[PDB]
Each structure stands twice: as C-alpha cells, then as structure tokens.
C-alpha cells in the first residue's frame, strides 16, 4: 500500500513541528504503520519523536507518542483518559547514535494492528517489542486528538518531551503491514549480526562474544548461545561458532562447538517484568565463557569453555572440591550413583566406571561424549522443555529420549556440582568441532576449578606455546601448552584481589613478552607483564585514562600488526565509564620501545557515552581492518535483561580510530 502521508528532512532543534493539517484528516480505520528514518546523536534525556495528541485543556493524558531516552531506549505511549487506558511499551538499548563519528540513520517501524490487537516495534531491522492487549486502542481513536507533532507532544498547548535530532523520513500507512513487508524496508545499519534470534542455535539471547583471526584468513567467532534469558548459569547455554571468509562481510550459519541435550533448544521470549524477570532455567547443564586460539604446529583450532552440571552456576558451585579424586599423581572424575549419599565412583582409564568402596570395576562405562553406557548399551533420559504457560516458569519432561550424560539432572551417575573447564578442537577451522574433554584440576584435589577468561587465548609467534588465561580468587592462573593442547600446566600470578572476576586478555608485545590486561574491582583496568613466555609474571599495575565501574567489565585486547605514528600499537576494547556499561571505546596505545610502557594516545568512541557497551571481542582482520563483536547494551543493568539482537558486529579502519 502507498503511504497516506510522507515527509522528510525535519530538523528537531528543541522546537516541535506541527503537521496536523497534513496528517490528521488522512488517518482512518483502526490499524496504522509508522515508518521513520531518524538521527539523534545528541538526544535530550527523554524526547518524543512523533506525537498525536488531544492538545486541549484537561486532556493532558490523551496522546500517542513514540519516544526515546538518552540511554538508547525506544518506546511508545498510547493514552486515553476516558477509556481509562495508559499503555506504555518500550525496550532499552534499541538505538544507534553515532558510527565513525557520524550520526546514524535509525530505521524505525511501528505497527499498530487492530485485528491482532498487537503493537509491534522494529528498529534497524530488529523487533524490539511485540505487545498484545485485551482492549485495543487504535492510535487515532484517542478521544479529541487535534494535533500531529514531530519532536514533541502537545499537551494542553505546551511542548512536552522536546526532541533534539532529525527525521530524514517519515511515512504513515492506514494498514498494519505484515512482518514480510517490514523486512523489505531498506535499512542504513552501521552494524551486522553474526548470531541472531531465529538462527540455527534457536537461542533468543547471546552474550560473551569472541573473535579470532586464523592463519588461512578465516575469521572465527564464538559466543554463549543463551536460552533462558541473558542470565549466567544456572541456565541452558550452548557455545556456538560462526566464521567469515570475506573479512567479516558475511558469516556462516552457526554450529555448536559445545552442547548439551538434557533440555530442548527453545527460542523463548523471557519475561522482562519485575515479578518474573529473575526466572531461571534451574535443572539444565550448561556451558559459559568460551575462548579461542589457533595452533601453528598442528593447524588445529582449540576452544575452551566453562562447564556446569545441571542446576549449577558459579554462585552455587561447590568450592573446596575439584570434582576429581587424586590417585598416584593421577586425576579421576568422581561420580555419585542414584541412591548414594556420597561419591563412591570414579571414571578410570577407558571410561571404566570404578567403584571406590569395593575397588571393583562396574559394568558401567562413560563414553567420549560423557554419556553413560551399561554393558556397552547406551542409557537415556527424558528431555525437558520450559514454558511460561502457567504464569510462572515450568520445567517438564517432553517425551523425547536423549543419551544419558553425567552432567545431567536425570542421570544415574552424576558429577560433582562444581565448575569445570572443557576443551574441544576443530580440524577444519570451525566447520565442525570434536566432542569436548575436561581439563584436569590445576590447583589441587580439594580446590574448585578456575574460571576461563572469555575471548582469545594466545599463540606465541616464535614458538609452539599456547596460553589460556583463567582466574580464581587471589590470582590469574595461566594454562600453558607446548604440545598442541594435549597437556597443560599452570602458571599462577597472584593479584591484589580476593574474589575478583579477573577476566584477563593477553597481547605479545614482542618475542617472549606478554602483557595481560584484566578486569578488577578498583574501577581501573589492571595489567601485568611476563618476559618469560608466561613462566613468571610481574606485579600488578593499573591503567590511567580509562574508567570502569566498581564491578568492572571484560576488556579485549590485541597487538596490531602495522605501526601507528611509527610505533608498535596495542588496541583495547572496553566501556569507558564509572557509572555503568556504556561509553564503549577502542583505545589505541603506542609502545615505548625503551621500557615497554604504553602511551594511550587515541580514544575512539564506538557510540554515544550514554549508549550501552559491555563485553567485547576484537580482532585484526586479514585486510588490516578491525572487527568488533560486542554487547551493545548494559549487561549488568537489571533493567536491560533479556534483550534480543544486541550483540552486534562492526568493521573499522585504523584511520577511523586516530
Ligand atoms: O598474531 S596472532 O596472535 O596469531 C592473531 C592474528 N595475527 C594476524 C596477522 C595478520 C593480520 C591479521 C592478524 C592475533 C590475535 O588477536 C588473533 O587474532 C590471532
Ligand atoms: O560481569 S557479568 O555478571 O556480566 C558476567 C560474569 N560471569 C562470571 C561467571 C563465569 C562462569 C560461570 C558463571 Cl555462573 C558466572
């Protein structure tokens, strides 16, 4: 259908524009579609882009508006006092502000559909909310509407919610256009999606992006595919990967690097209301926090992630137990059988389930996939699905049998409810992944395992050494391999923190010299240095010029291949803010060859200081551009839980940063 109204190049400079006579008499019927292309790179705290209102004395609460906040939140109000209706629908972190220093043209599509009684909002090709109501209010059936306004709402003759920005284009339709029609609307997005709702993972949520550039020129990415909202474990979460063979322009359909099957992979719209938003899938095993490295010697790609048995996150994870029993310098995975109060079993060589009380092997073995066999026959359990049909979260059996796994709730043999690290490998650069194996414990039998630092591991340039950073209370624990990940040793480096989430990433400044940047609890990013290829580590220093919150955020970091202003350069990705996870920056640092100190010279603002930016991944693409895959929202805020399609990818060039 053709628009009933179309207009453009409106400048909103804290003064509303009246389009009443152009628009009001064109509106008819009960369904409408608003299509608006708009910029706001210096928005006011709260502003209305578009308004329909009764502007008369005593009808201040009779209006329709599309508003935004300087946080990047978008929403609408639909209000009619006589009908007793005050609808308010919105979603945080829905907008872009600036990209490469230039105001982004956001494409907004709002559908008001009387037949389905549903209001639906899209921004930049992403559905950010879809709300169905009992009593529908057509946007132009509001009692006494007499104004159509851009850049404010006229209430009782005065300008409310004054906007600063521009509307390059606005169209209205006397129809609710289909989802199909919406998808044909052209966009000017500054970003791409690698992982997204409805893709092959069937996760509606994603967190913890990684990026790594392989020797073939393929760029590889991993991520938490999170099913039970954006919650950290306990939940259901898989690790998914995707790769690009054209310098990030296009990405493959995701596959899983690590997955469990005890719960269905379901795309669920997780509740965002204050009563139900902390609902959490509580009986599923999960993975969380992945990291990637490539091994020159073998050519293999290697991916680690934390593993959690059913119902377990770092919160309720059994500290003081590694989940392994030591017997003669050998570590064996412990198991507890259905009905026993203690762990009477261990998994010995050839997965033979061994009975520690009577020292006899049993007829049970554990296969490669940590699945349980009896006399060679595969045991099964019934899969669970989740739903909110009853009004609260329900987890229930769904009729499907899946292989019985020792990380499962319904398993006859269960591992220790604590956190593990798993490793998997790919021989085809991320086209398929092997079944994972658990790493051994590194800090002793009666210590729980360390926590993987998400992002990249480090492959030293001049050797076969592979390093993955992990953290635990009081130290960074570097995992080191010189044989393609077949065996690992620890290098402990104490840090001045108890119970920090010391997420650490490394760069090799020069042969043998590793600088590690890490999250702390001080509001500053810390670093330490090894001149030892990771054998030994310096004391801890802190970076000036960048602020974090008290709780901190993951920082990603690379050593750039080309010189900048004649110097070797390091690039940091982090939010820069003492208030929240926002104000995303790439910070370019030039190395001083004399002492390996770093002058943080250029700060590139990814988007507005007020717009969200949390965990991030950065890599130098083969063409020397920079790829950034990041959480474009505040992943700490309890107001921004369970948002879809907020982990986004951008391409930058060095000149943009400087
Ligand atoms: O130097 S590596 O550590 O092997 C690595 C890639 N270097 C190429 C060099 C050639 C240009 C693209 C990047 C940097 C890490 O951030 C990973 O992306 C892997
Ligand atoms: O700073 S955040 O809260 O956004 C994310 C911190 N995740 C830490 C963690 C690691 C492994 C398992 C679990 Cl359950 C939690």
Swiss-Prot record:
Q: What family is reported?
A: Belongs to the glycosyl hydrolase 33 family.
**For this protein, what is the EC number?**
3.2.1.18
Source organism per UniProt? Streptococcus pneumoniae serotype 4 (strain ATCC BAA-334 / TIGR4)
What cellular component GO annotations does this protein have?
A: cytoplasm; intracellular membrane-bounded organelle; membrane
Keyword tags: Glycosidase, Hydrolase, Repeat, Signal
Care to name a GO molecular-function term for this sequence? exo-alpha-sialidase activity
Q: Return the protein name.
A: Sialidase B
Under CDD domains, the record lists: Sialidase_non-viral (cd15482)
UniProt-listed GO biological process terms:
ganglioside catabolic process; oligosaccharide catabolic process
Q: Could you tell me which InterPro entries the record lists for this protein?
A: BNR_rpt, ConA-like_dom_sf, Glyco_hydro_33_N, Sialidase, Sialidase_fam, Sialidase_sf, Trans_sialidase_dom3
Renumbered ranges of BNR repeats:
242-253, 424-435, 479-490, 528-539
KW Phosphoprotein (keyword) present: no
């Amino acid at each position: 259908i053709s628009p009933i109204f179309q207009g453009g190049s409106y400048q909103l400079n804290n003064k509303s524009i009246d389009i009443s006579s152009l628009l009001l008499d064109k509106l008819s019927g009960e369904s409408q579609t608003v299509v608006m292309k708009f910029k706001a790179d210096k928005p006011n705290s709260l502003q209305a882009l578009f308004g329909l209102s009764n502007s008369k004395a005593g009808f201040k609460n009779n209006y329709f508006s599309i508003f935004m906040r300087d946080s990047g939140e978008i929403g609408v109000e639909i209000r009619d006092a006589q009908k007793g209706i005050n609808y308010l629908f919105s979603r945080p972190a829905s907008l872009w502000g600036k990209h490469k220093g230039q105001a982004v043209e956001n494409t907004l599509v709002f559908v008001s559909d009387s037949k389905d009684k549903t209001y639906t909002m899209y921004v930049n090709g992403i559905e950010v909310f879809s709300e169905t109501v009992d009593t529908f209010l057509p946007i132009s059936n509001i009692n006494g509407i007499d104004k159509a306004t851009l850049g404010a709402v006229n209430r009782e003759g005065k300008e409310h919610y004054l906007a600063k920005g521009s509307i390059d284009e606005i169209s209205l339709f006397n129809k609710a256009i289909s989802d199909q029609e919406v998808s044909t609307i052209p966009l000017s997005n500054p970003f791409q999606l690698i992982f997204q709702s409805g893709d092959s993972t069937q996760a509606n949520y994603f967190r913890i992006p990684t990026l790594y550039t392989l020797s073939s020129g393929r760029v590889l990415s991993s991520i938490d595919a999170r099913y039970g909202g954006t919650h950290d474990s306990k939940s259901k979460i898989n690790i998914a990967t995707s790769y690009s063979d054209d310098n990030g322009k296009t990405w493959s359909e995701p596959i899983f690097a690590m997955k469990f099957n005890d719960y269905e992979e379901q795309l669920v719209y997780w509740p965002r209301d204050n009563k139900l938003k902390n609902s959490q899938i509580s009986g599923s095993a999960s993975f969380i926090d992945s990291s990637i490295v490539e091994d020159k010697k073998s050519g293999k790609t290697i991916l680690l992630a934390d593993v959690m048995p059913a119902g377990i996150g770092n919160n309720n994870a059994n500290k003081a137990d590694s989940g392994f029993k030591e017997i003669n310098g050998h570590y064996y995975l412990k198991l507890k059988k259905n009905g026993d109060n203690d762990f009477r079993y261990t998994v010995r060589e050839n997965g033979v389930v061994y009975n520690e009380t009577t020292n006899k092997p049993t007829n049970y073995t554990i296969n490669d996939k940590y699945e349980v066999l009896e006399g060679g026959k595969s045991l099964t359990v019934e899969q669970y699905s989740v739903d909110f049909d009853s009004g609260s979260l329900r987890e229930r059996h769904n009729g499907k049998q899946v292989p019985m796994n020792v990380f499962y709730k319904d398993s006859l043999f269960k591992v220790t409810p604590t956190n593990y690290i798993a490793m998997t490998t790919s021989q085809n650069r991320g086209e398929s992944w092997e079944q994972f194996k658990l790493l051994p414990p590194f800090l002793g039998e009666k210590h729980n395992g360390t926590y993987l630092c998400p992002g990249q591991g480090l492959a030293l340039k001049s050797s076969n050494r592979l390093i993955f950073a992990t953290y635990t209370s009081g130290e960074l624990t570097y995992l080191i391999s010189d044989d393609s990940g077949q065996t690992w040793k620890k290098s402990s480096a104490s840090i001045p923190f108890k119970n920090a989430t010391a997420e650490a990433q490394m760069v090799e400044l020069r042969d043998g010299v590793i600088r590690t940047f890490f999250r702390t609890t001080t509001g500053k990013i810390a670093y330490m240095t090894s001149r030892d290829s990771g054998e030994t580590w310096s004391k801890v220093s802190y970076i000036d010029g960048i602020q974090q919150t008290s709780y901190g955020t993951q920082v990603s970091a690379i050593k750039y291949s080309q010189l900048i202003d004649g110097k070797e350069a390091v690039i940091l990705s982090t939010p820069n803010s003492r208030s929240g996870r926002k104000g995303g920056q790439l910070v370019v640092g030039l190395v001083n060859k004399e002492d390996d100190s770093i002058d943080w010279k250029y700060h590139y603002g990814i988007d507005l200081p007020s717009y969200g930016y949390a965990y991030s991944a950065i890599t130098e693409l083969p063409n020397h551009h920079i790829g950034v895959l990041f959480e474009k929202y505040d992943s700490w805020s309890r107001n921004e839980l369970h948002l879809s399609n907020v982990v986004q990818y951008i391409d930058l060039e060095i000149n943009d940063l400087t």
